Design a protein around this ligand. Structure first.
Ligand code: FES
Ligand code: K
Ligand code: K
Ligand code: K
Ligand code: MG
Ligand code: MG
Ligand code: MG
Ligand code: MG
Ligand code: MG
Ligand code: MG
Ligand code: MG
Ligand code: MG
Ligand code: MG
Ligand code: MG
Ligand code: MG
Ligand code: MG
Ligand code: MG
Ligand code: MG
Ligand code: MG
Ligand code: MG
Lengths: 23, 72, 122, 48, 86, 128, 58, 137, 74, 97
RNA sequence: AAACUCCAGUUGACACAAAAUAGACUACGAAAGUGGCUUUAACAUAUCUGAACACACAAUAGCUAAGACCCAAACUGGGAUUAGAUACCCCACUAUGCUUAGCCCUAAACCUCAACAGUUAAAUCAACAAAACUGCUCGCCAGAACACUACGAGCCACAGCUUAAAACUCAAAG
């Protein structure tokens, strides 16, 4: 199977951690 | 078959004799079969032990002129 | 239970080797050991250079002590041997002969594993 | 049978009385545990 | 460091035949696994990558040892065609 | 705890062991044996004191006694090895198993359940 | 003898963790791999070296 | 007698002699074959330096030291300096799997030294220090 | 192929037919195209060996059943 | 009925199970002569069972005895003791070819 | 290239680090994990099933405090590459990996295949994968995305973890 579902979740978590750090 | 027990011991003690099996002849009798037939005959007498009965069979064949060279 | 002390002693003259063996056997007895036998395996060249007690040893006297001791004695005896300057190396093992050799009938052959993959056409 | 064998074996155990004598006897003797196996499974003890 | 020197991995030259001696030594090191161990020890193989290689090396042996057993089993049938024409 | 001079359970009934040499007696005693050999004697003492038939090892009573001896051995092991997580699990599981055995005995034979609790000093507690 | 395959693969019967994790199913194909071409090496470096060294000397 | 690949044991008595010298007395040629350099030091049997030559000391620079030809040149240089000090027979001890592992010995032979043995001392840790991380190439 | 010659003689002697050679695809199920529209197919097919030379069922066993031809087979 | 029908037995011709050369013998760590027969003469590496031909039980016993002898000051680690180089060769390995 | 030249090679002395070969073995443990040697203790249950939360555990990373330090090494600095190179390659060195005492409680913690008891005959069977099913029990799942998110609650956790939605949008997602 491809990892396209993981990739969406990967970006969501990345952007969330950056937001929490910024604020 | 019952005689396979005898055949197995004969082949272990003596091995396949130099006499070659002729499987084309439907009535060929190998040295092992001759032993089986004699051993089976002595069993009818009433001997109930293998060791003694086995030893007695070899002696009968030696009297008849069969060559029984043991592996030893 | 029964143990075996594999004692590699420093290569010394007979009077000193006899004192060390007496010293060692008395230490076992002082800790509750019943010493069964003492075997001399002979003086040999050590397999490798062993540095013990600020000395480099190239030869040693191999001795075996067969003794029965309480389980708590083993830890104590190991400490005593660490401080003896005439002992190059001392190891206490459970005697090899307490373990009875199990009876083996021979090698049981194992066939090629089967039905690992389906029999469908690929 | 095990207790009986042990009672016979306990006679030849090293004690504080015979320790010195048993040490001297050990220093004289040699016990070799070395032996080699062959391809036929026969033990070849050392000849020394 | 502690062991005696000039006993391990030492090979004597016969009649100044250095080539044959070096080939012999290299074959001893290969057949024991030293040459392949040295090359793998240059960089750290992480534990997960080492298990993946061992599994790969083990599955290849099995396949390679079973193919060879079939090749030697069928080599008998490389003889000339006995029924040439049918 | 059984005195260290207590003879092993195997040699306690061999005829004439009271007359053997002192050295032989201490070689066949608990002092010269591992910890598991002393636990077999503890089990026998509890079995004789509590169980009606000390030779029936398959009754719910004998099984509670045997497990209680193991529980005590785990408690002593953990007093020295306080960070042994594997044995702490074995202790907690063994305690839960004995509670299930005691619940079954209480439900079936109340007269013997009281003798188990008295002999082994177990206080039965109803679950929350 | 070929290494055993009993309990080596992750199968329903197998209780233990898999020993082997083959990427391809372990089933003999009907072909063998081609003969590999020997990787070329530069020849006559020693003889080249002696000629070039003498050139330097002379 | 049949040729024994196994070296003569120092303690036991052997008949094998090289110019009247026993195996324990022959000078040793220590070759360190690295991935980028080859270093050859010829020492006496009593650990007294006699000759040293590396690919660096022979004028090869940077990536040109890690070549067979460069190691061979170092071998010849070490042999020349060793032969001046009286070395004929040498026991080669090579450690490392670099490009100049074999070439270095050819250089030593081309220089007039006779190799009576070939030992490998490549360091192999039995479990040791964790090596550097794998390169991403 | 050890018995191809024997079998082909036996067929000729009894006035019957033998096909001991490589069985080309469609000999039975595509006969009208291969032989001709008015070709008459066999009424009985006797398999003296039912396996081909890769130890699998001879294709004609399946094709005879498709064409409703009874088959005798060793 | 008939007397010639096959009877039910266990294969009377069955051969005895093969036994490793060390089947039934005590492997002691002190017996370094025996243990040396299963290590490489050049590297001291312990040979695998495909070379030694030992059963799984004896391969473990030999391995554990070697590791004990080596750390207890009985056996060298990096080479085979030269004294034991002439013992009977029992390992199926060819180094010179 | 930088770096080093207080350097390198040989020899001797020399760890609070990591454990060739064996292992082509396939074992131990509930799982996580466990492969140098020795000794001590020691691997629950005589029906099975039974919890995100009770109870006890749980790789790596990380936190708190005290130690050890060979080597490795986030970060950082230098060299090089490049249009740029906050990377890939080279060098150096730190947190960290280790020990002791408490935390934290996550993983592609996946053999993505639940525990127990059976079966190989029928329809064997969407496809692929690691053949298809029966009894019984517990857990869990009901279009995609929003969402390993918001709010509430609990927690030694305070840029955390566990539990976990909706509005708007789409006719697909898979
Ligand atoms: S086959 Fe019996 S121990 Fe090896
Ligand atoms: K190790
Ligand atoms: K959880
Ligand atoms: K997985
Ligand atoms: Mg998103
Ligand atoms: Mg895949
Ligand atoms: Mg520079
Ligand atoms: Mg349960
Ligand atoms: Mg619930
Ligand atoms: Mg954790
Ligand atoms: Mg930490
Ligand atoms: Mg460093
Ligand atoms: Mg640090
Ligand atoms: Mg895992
Ligand atoms: Mg369940
Ligand atoms: Mg089942
Ligand atoms: Mg998460
Ligand atoms: Mg959250
Ligand atoms: Mg809410
Ligand atoms: Mg909140």
């Amino acid at each position: 199977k491809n990892v396209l579902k993981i990739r969406r979740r990967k970006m969501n978590h990345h952007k969330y951690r950056k937001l929490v750090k910024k604020t | 078959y019952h005689e396979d027990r005898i055949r197995a011991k004969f082949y272990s003690v003596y091995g396949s004799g130099q006499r070659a099996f002729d499987l084309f002849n439907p009535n060929f009798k190998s040295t092992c079969q001759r032993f089986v037939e004699k051993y089976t005959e002595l069993q009818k007498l009433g001997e109930t032990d293998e060791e003694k009965l086995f030893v007695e069979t070899g002696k009968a064949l030696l009297a008849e002129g069969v060559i029984l060279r043991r592996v030893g | 239970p029964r143990y075996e002390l594999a004692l590699i002693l420093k290569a010394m003259q007979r009077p000193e080797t006899a004192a060390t063996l007496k010293r060692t056997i008395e230490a076992l007895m002082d800790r509750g050991a019943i010493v069964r036998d003492l075997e001399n395996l002979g003086e040999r060249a050590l397999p490798y250079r062993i540095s013990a007690h600020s000395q480099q040893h190239n030869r040693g006297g191999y001795f075996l002590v067969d003794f029965y001791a309480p389980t708590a004695a083993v830890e104590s005896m190991v400490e005593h041997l660490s401080r003896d300057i005439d002992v190059i190396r001392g190891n206490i093992v459970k005697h090899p002969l307490t373990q009875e050799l199990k009876e083996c009938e021979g090698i049981v052959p194992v066939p090629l594993a089967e039905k690992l993959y389906s029999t469908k056409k690929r | 049978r095990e207790v009986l064998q042990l009672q016979e074996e306990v006679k030849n155990f090293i004690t504080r009385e015979n320790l010195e004598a048993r040490v001297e006897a050990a220093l004289d003797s040699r016990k070799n545990y070395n032996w080699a196996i062959t391809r036929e499974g026969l033990v070849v003890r050392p000849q020394r | 460091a502690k062991h005696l020197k000039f006993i391990a991995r030492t090979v004597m030259v016969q009649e100044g035949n250095v080539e044959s001696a070096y080939r012999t030594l290299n074959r001893i090191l290969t057949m024991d696994g030293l040459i392949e161990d040295i090359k793998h020890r240059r960089y750290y193989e992480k534990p997960c990558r080492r298990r993946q290689r061992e599994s790969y090396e083990r599955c290849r042996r099995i396949y390679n040892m079973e193919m060879a057993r079939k090749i030697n089993f069928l080599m008998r049938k490389n003889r000339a065609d006995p029924w040439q024409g049918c | 705890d059984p005195p260290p001079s207590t003879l092993l359970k195997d040699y306690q009934n061999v005829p004439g062991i009271e007359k053997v040499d002192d050295v032989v007696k201490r070689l066949l005693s608990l002092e010269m044996a591992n910890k598991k050999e002393m636990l077999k004697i503890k089990q026998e003492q509890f079995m004789k004191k509590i169980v009606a038939n000390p030779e029936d090892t398959r009754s719910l009573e004998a099984r509670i006694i045997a497990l209680s001896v193991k529980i005590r051995s785990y408690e002593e092991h953990l007093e020295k090895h306080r960070k042994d997580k594997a044995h702490k699990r074995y202790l907690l599981m063994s305690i839960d198993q004995r509670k299930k055995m005691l619940k079954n005995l209480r439900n079936t034979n109340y007269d013997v359940f009281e003798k188990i609790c008295w002999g082994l000093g177990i206080e039965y507690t109803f679950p929350p | 003898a070929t290494p055993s395959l009993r309990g080596r693969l992750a199968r329903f019967g197998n209780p233990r963790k898999p020993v082997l994790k083959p990427n391809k199913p372990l089933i003999l194909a009907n072909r063998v791999g081609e003969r590999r071409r020997e990787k070329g090496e530069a020849t006559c470096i020693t003889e080249m070296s002696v000629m070039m060294a003498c050139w330097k000397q002379n | 007698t049949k040729f024994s690949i196994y070296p003569p044991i120092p303690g036991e008595e052997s008949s094998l002699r090289w110019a009247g010298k026993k195996f324990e007395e022959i000078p040793i040629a220590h070759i360190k074959a690295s991935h980028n350099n080859t270093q050859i030091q010829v020492v006496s049997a009593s650990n007294e330096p006699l000759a040293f030559a590396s690919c660096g000391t022979e004028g090869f620079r940077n990536a040109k030291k890690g070549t067979g030809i460069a190691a061979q040149t170092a071998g010849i240089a070490a042999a020349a300096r060793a032969k001046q000090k009286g070395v004929i027979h040498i026991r080669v001890v090579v450690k490392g799997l670099g490009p100049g592992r074999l070439s270095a010995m050819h250089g030593l032979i081309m220089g007039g030294l006779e190799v009576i043995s070939i030992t490998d001392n490549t360091p192999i840790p039995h479990x040791g220090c964790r090596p550097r991380k794998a390169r991403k190439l | 192929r050890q018995f191809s010659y024997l079998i082909e003689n036996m067929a000729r002697d009894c006035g019957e037919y033998a096909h001991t050679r490589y069985f080309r695809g469609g000999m039975l199920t595509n006969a009208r195209l291969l032989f001709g529209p008015t070709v008459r197919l066999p009424d009985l097919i006797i398999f003296l060996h039912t396996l081909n030379n890769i130890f699998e069922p001879h294709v004609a066993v399946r094709d005879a059943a498709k064409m409703n031809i009874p088959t005798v087979g060793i | 009925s008939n007397e010639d029908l096959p009877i039910s037995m266990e294969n009377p011709y069955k051969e005895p199970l093969k036994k490793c050369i060390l089947c039934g013998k005590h492997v002691d760590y002190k017996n370094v002569q025996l243990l040396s027969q299963f290590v490489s003469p050049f590297t001291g590496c312990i040979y695998g069972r495909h070379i030694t031909g030992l059963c799984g039980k004896k391969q473990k016993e030999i391995t554990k005895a070697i590791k004990r002898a080596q750390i207890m000051g009985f056996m060298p680690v990096t080479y085979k003791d030269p004294a034991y180089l002439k013992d009977p060769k029992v390992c199926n390995i060819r180094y010179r070819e």
